[PDB]
């Protein structure tokens, strides 16, 4: 559970925002890419796994689960690549409401940034610092620290 | 000291690798950019501050310290922008041996990657997971979680 992440891909402004969510805390990392290819997904996961101890990734769709480039990055970085079938139906709704939350935040900042990538990173910042009480960024550090100890 | 980071800019292959080091742990984040500009430095700091609780950044040179764009991102993200003067002369040496270490690692992976950006992220991953024993990625989570508690 400290090591479990979920990929999520949402669209805005004719571009693609790829998100990784740490399931137990709700902490996120995200980037803007022009399209969701195995090469872009693979690089994103290599970045994530060098920053946090990523044990398993639930992929966002079957193309990224099938992609040999994505499996090559998960092999390189020591990640268990898994499907993202919502066996617990609560997952679909949680992801959908996180996407709606992030798009709401992005609209609230959007005129402070010329480029969408800036607005998405301001939205990641606001999401991870929001106290709901602790923030997701506090929760992820507590969880992984408890696991290390 | 849980909140203090140092910027560092090194070059390879005609490109610039911008690095942020968390001083108390030695954990790093890095990216490849075509040139150091205030705009690229500012966006890197926005990314870093949405992922870790960045209180102070010691800038890598006087152009990034002077840059109004960098100061604007430090204002946005709540970061105290400071100079990088090595009042403790041990800092110069630590940074230099970190860049030599990263370049060493990059050479050891370089032929597994077509693009330098992949190699630099493989080197971030190896640096942060290396046990010297706790790793830098273990030390940063411990330090921050101890601070939150």
């Amino acid at each position: 559970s400290p090591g479990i992440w979920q990929l999520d891909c949402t669209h805005l402004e004719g571009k693609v925002i790829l998100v990784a969510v740490h399931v137990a805390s709700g902490y996120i990392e995200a980037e803007v890419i022009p399209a969701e290819t195995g090469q872009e997904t693979a690089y994103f996961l290599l970045k994530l796994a060098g920053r946090w101890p990523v044990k398993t990734v639930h992929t966002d769709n079957g193309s990224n689960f099938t992609s040999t480039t994505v499996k090559a990055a998960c092999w390189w970085a020591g990640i268990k690549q898994e499907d993202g079938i919502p066996y617990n139906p609560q997952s679909q709704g949680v992801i959908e409401s996180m996407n709606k939350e992030l798009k709401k935040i992005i609209g609230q900042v959007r005129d402070q940034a010329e480029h969408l990538k800036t607005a998405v990173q301001m939205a990641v910042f606001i999401h991870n610092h929001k106290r709901k009480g602790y923030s997701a960024g506090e929760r992820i550090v507590d969880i992984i620290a408890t696991d290390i100890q | 000291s849980p909140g203090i980071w140092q910027l560092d800019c090194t070059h390879l292959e005609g490109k610039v690798i911008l690095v942020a080091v968390h001083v108390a742990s030695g954990y790093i984040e890095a990216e490849v950019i075509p040139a150091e500009t205030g705009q690229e430095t500012a966006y890197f700091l926005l990314k870093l501050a949405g992922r870790w609780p960045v209180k102070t950044v010691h800038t890598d040179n006087g152009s990034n310290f002077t840059s109004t764009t960098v100061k604007a991102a430090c204002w946005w993200a709540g970061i105290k922008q400071e100079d990088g003067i090595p009042y403790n002369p041990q800092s110069q040496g630590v940074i230099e041996s970190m860049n030599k270490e990263l370049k060493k690692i990059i050479g050891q992976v370089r032929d597994q990657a077509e693009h330098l950006k992949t190699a630099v992220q493989m080197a971030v991953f190896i640096h942060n997971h290396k046990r010297k024993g706790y790793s830098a990625g273990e030390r940063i989570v411990d330090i921050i979680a101890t601070d939150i508690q």
């Binding site: 090469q39 690089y43 480039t69 | 597994q112 992949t118």
Partner: peptide
């Protein structure tokens, strides 16, 4: 071309 980021 036999690389992680370019398997071809």
């Amino acid at each position: 071309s036999d690389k992680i980021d370019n398997l071809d």
